[PDB]
Design a protein around this ligand. Sequence first.
Ligand code: MG
Ligand code: MG
Ligand code: MG
Ligand code: MG
Ligand code: MG
Ligand code: MG
Ligand code: MG
Ligand code: MG
Ligand code: MG
Ligand code: MG
Ligand code: MG
Ligand code: MG
Ligand code: MG
Ligand code: MG
Ligand code: MG
Ligand code: MG
Ligand code: MG
Ligand code: MG
Ligand code: MG
Ligand code: MG
Ligand code: MG
Ligand code: MG
Ligand code: MG
Ligand code: MG
Ligand code: MG
Ligand code: MG
Ligand code: MG
Ligand code: MG
Ligand code: MG
Ligand code: MG
Ligand code: MG
Ligand code: MG
Ligand code: MG
Ligand code: MG
Ligand code: MG
Ligand code: MG
Ligand code: MG
Ligand code: MG
Ligand code: MG
Ligand code: MG
Ligand code: MG
Lengths: 208, 225, 156
Amino acid sequence: GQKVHPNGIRLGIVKPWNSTWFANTKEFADNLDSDFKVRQYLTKELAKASVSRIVIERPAKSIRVTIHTARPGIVIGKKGEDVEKLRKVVADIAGVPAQINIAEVRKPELDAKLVADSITSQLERRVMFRRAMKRAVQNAMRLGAKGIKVEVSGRLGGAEIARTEWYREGRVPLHTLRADIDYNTSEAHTTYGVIGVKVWIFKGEILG
Amino acid sequence: TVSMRDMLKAGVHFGHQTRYWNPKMKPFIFGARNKVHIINLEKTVPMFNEALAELNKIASRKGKILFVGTKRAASEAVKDAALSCDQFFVNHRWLGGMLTNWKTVRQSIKRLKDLETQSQDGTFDKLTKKEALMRTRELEKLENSLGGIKDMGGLPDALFVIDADHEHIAIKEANNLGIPVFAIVDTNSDPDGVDFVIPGNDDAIRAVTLYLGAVAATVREGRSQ
Amino acid sequence: ELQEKLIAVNRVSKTVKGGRIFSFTALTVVGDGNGRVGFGYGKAREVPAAIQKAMEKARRNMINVALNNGTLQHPVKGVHTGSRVFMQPASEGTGIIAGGAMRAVLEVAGVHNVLAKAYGSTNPINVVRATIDGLENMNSPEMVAAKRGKSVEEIL
RNA sequence: GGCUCU
RNA sequence: CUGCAUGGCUGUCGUCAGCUCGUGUUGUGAAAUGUUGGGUUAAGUCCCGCAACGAGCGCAACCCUUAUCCUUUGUUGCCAG
RNA sequence: AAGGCGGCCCCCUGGACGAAGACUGACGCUCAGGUGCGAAAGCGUGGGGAGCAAACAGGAUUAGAUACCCUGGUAGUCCACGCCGUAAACGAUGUCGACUUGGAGGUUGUGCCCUUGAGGCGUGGCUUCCGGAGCUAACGCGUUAAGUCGACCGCCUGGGGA
RNA sequence: GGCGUAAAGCGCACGCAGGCGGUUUGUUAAGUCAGAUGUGAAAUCCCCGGGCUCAACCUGGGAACUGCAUCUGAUACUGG
Ligand SMILES: [Mg+2]
Ligand SMILES: [Mg+2]
Ligand SMILES: [Mg+2]
Ligand SMILES: [Mg+2]
Ligand SMILES: [Mg+2]
Ligand SMILES: [Mg+2]
Ligand SMILES: [Mg+2]
Ligand SMILES: [Mg+2]
Ligand SMILES: [Mg+2]
Ligand SMILES: [Mg+2]
Ligand SMILES: [Mg+2]
Ligand SMILES: [Mg+2]
Ligand SMILES: [Mg+2]
Ligand SMILES: [Mg+2]
Ligand SMILES: [Mg+2]
Ligand SMILES: [Mg+2]
Ligand SMILES: [Mg+2]
Ligand SMILES: [Mg+2]
Ligand SMILES: [Mg+2]
Ligand SMILES: [Mg+2]
Ligand SMILES: [Mg+2]
Ligand SMILES: [Mg+2]
Ligand SMILES: [Mg+2]
Ligand SMILES: [Mg+2]
Ligand SMILES: [Mg+2]
Ligand SMILES: [Mg+2]
Ligand SMILES: [Mg+2]
Ligand SMILES: [Mg+2]
Ligand SMILES: [Mg+2]
Ligand SMILES: [Mg+2]
Ligand SMILES: [Mg+2]
Ligand SMILES: [Mg+2]
Ligand SMILES: [Mg+2]
Ligand SMILES: [Mg+2]
Ligand SMILES: [Mg+2]
Ligand SMILES: [Mg+2]
Ligand SMILES: [Mg+2]
Ligand SMILES: [Mg+2]
Ligand SMILES: [Mg+2]
Ligand SMILES: [Mg+2]
Ligand SMILES: [Mg+2]
């Protein structure tokens, strides 16, 4: 019960919001429900797709969803086949005309949500958690990260006594505000319970 | 290469008092004058000449030599001798693990080089000038400690030491690594960790200069050979 | 190549303000199938790191042992701190008759026929030190011949 | 100044 | 229902200045050194010294606001002339 | 010898050490049982009795206070002769002998050098501290060994119960 | 195998019996060593073999029974 969320603390400095629109109070919470429902839908559909960051922006009563994903071939299919299928249901949910853009994720090993979900998928298919944490750290420091910290929590190996473990390689300054800390969190629903995964990635300092 | 009355003129026969001496120096002590032991130069000369012969052996095959003295009296003399025979020196404090943890000290050799590159040659002007002074006293410290070996790159092949107890740490690190040791063993020291024992005074500047000049000679002659 | 055996792992502790800190120790021994033997003792928060540190220290600090064909040369004794250790050369194919840690150190030592006995404390660290000291100070007929200044045949 | 137990 | 099967979130000691690692070395070993010493600081802050050399999380700064000034832009704000 | 021994003087008396010589010629070491000595407290008889002080009494303190604190105070402490025969009676290290690097002292002899000053060089006895090898579980001991060996004795064998 | 601190040096000492005993020469030959002889029942154990279809088992021969006694020598050590 101690640490602030590094994204929410970095949101004015080096991190951008995942929703960049403007509205008055009349249509604010309605837009925010619509954004929640579409991020819900896209996560369930693109679960096998290595989606990282769903960015939502709505100008002129027209939603524009920018999906960042490690592979766009399975999300698109043919050019506007599955994307157009998801676009017409996004416009059904949002009630406005939609537009879907796709940003490819270079170096998917340097994206916190993908790493945590890969670990979660491994724990769900019953691998050793320490091997998963090692390979995530070795792969990120190989790919060029200045520092990674992972942390799992609870019911490890089906052990009735829940504990947390964490690995660290490189420097991860959380208190440094200009640090490009990619932080995200996943959950593994094992047969013995819920295993929580947190991941911090330090890319370097933005000199604004 | 140095005669006995040369050693006697420089002051090699002097030593320390009789309440500080090591009983292992009995085969090296001639007598005791004014409550001070006297070093047998009869056994000093042929042992120093055996050491210079082995120095000529290693510098024949281009071995690396490290001069070790941080007595704050022979610091400049051990520097001028190692830059005379372009070998490597330690004039200020022997860092603990300079040899055994070489792979760690190497990362400070590299840091000293990049700081010298950036500031003198690299002209790494225009930073926060207070950090430029923290860089300055950093580079001063690294040159003061690791400047004599910054071009060595690997482990040396022989170590020449001025005092076996003021520098007993370098003896142990060399003794572990199988590196031969040539040392000026005074009366208050231990001649066991030294592979080639040279009796003689340690604080006498004339004797330090005699030893170092005789080594920089038989090294340059062994280098050329 | 160099065969490597861990003898024993052990979990140790260290009590601090927060509570108990656990750690793991590893005792490994290496050898070339001949007289070159060496042991290591590593310690870390985790068991594979401890075996790796132990194998690292064991690959260095090797010691050379003047073996006979496949056995020792004379009945030798070794002590370290709790562990008087007796070992004896034996006939061909009688095996390694030895207890615990001494079996592992002699197996990587390349010995194959001993009659050993560990008296006293059988702590594996001290008994493996006592075996290393016994094999190290075991001397050959050549070394005793050069020492006494006689031939081997004059020694028999 | 002394000032028990858990 | 079980917070004594769990995640997540929060309190707390405590914004206290501390907690550790790698290699090296010492010790049979648990462990130690580093991290100790002299000063100094809000601070394991800095300097010097030293079997340690280095590094990391933290102590700091980078953030916001206030406090003075300048330029730009002057309405729905302003009024010296 | 240990326990232990503290003004000064005398009487009786034991032991140690040193220097040179002279003499005897293995006469020696250890020791079960045995014998003797053996702090304080205690006992007995006879004295003595200032101070201190178990006990005890009173005052306080405290929840209580058969205690610590206070005011008093008896055996006792003292002497002679006997008994007891124990102590963390400890160096918690049996006695005797031999060998093995050093340093700084203390004390007590003694030889020599011109004591050219209270100095200089030695050689014996006893003693303290540090410490090397080596030993030891470690702590530490370390030429006065807990090192390397020999001779003899005493003793130990899980914690209680005991 | 131990006894500074883990159990364990009598509180100290003298000292009988007892255990041990410097060095040299001579003698003895007790101890000791070597050899021989007698004995140490057989079985058993062990070795080399043989026989029951093998083995268990049975069995031939041998070694062994580390001992004791006598005699003959040896004389370094110990003793006298
Ligand atoms: Mg907080
Ligand atoms: Mg035991
Ligand atoms: Mg209590
Ligand atoms: Mg009660
Ligand atoms: Mg809880
Ligand atoms: Mg919880
Ligand atoms: Mg329960
Ligand atoms: Mg370390
Ligand atoms: Mg070690
Ligand atoms: Mg600390
Ligand atoms: Mg520490
Ligand atoms: Mg400090
Ligand atoms: Mg800091
Ligand atoms: Mg801060
Ligand atoms: Mg006579
Ligand atoms: Mg006696
Ligand atoms: Mg008696
Ligand atoms: Mg009395
Ligand atoms: Mg009386
Ligand atoms: Mg009376
Ligand atoms: Mg009275
Ligand atoms: Mg009273
Ligand atoms: Mg008693
Ligand atoms: Mg006493
Ligand atoms: Mg005492
Ligand atoms: Mg006693
Ligand atoms: Mg000492
Ligand atoms: Mg011993
Ligand atoms: Mg002794
Ligand atoms: Mg002892
Ligand atoms: Mg025992
Ligand atoms: Mg006790
Ligand atoms: Mg005891
Ligand atoms: Mg006693
Ligand atoms: Mg005799
Ligand atoms: Mg006879
Ligand atoms: Mg006979
Ligand atoms: Mg028979
Ligand atoms: Mg047959
Ligand atoms: Mg005789
Ligand atoms: Mg005789």
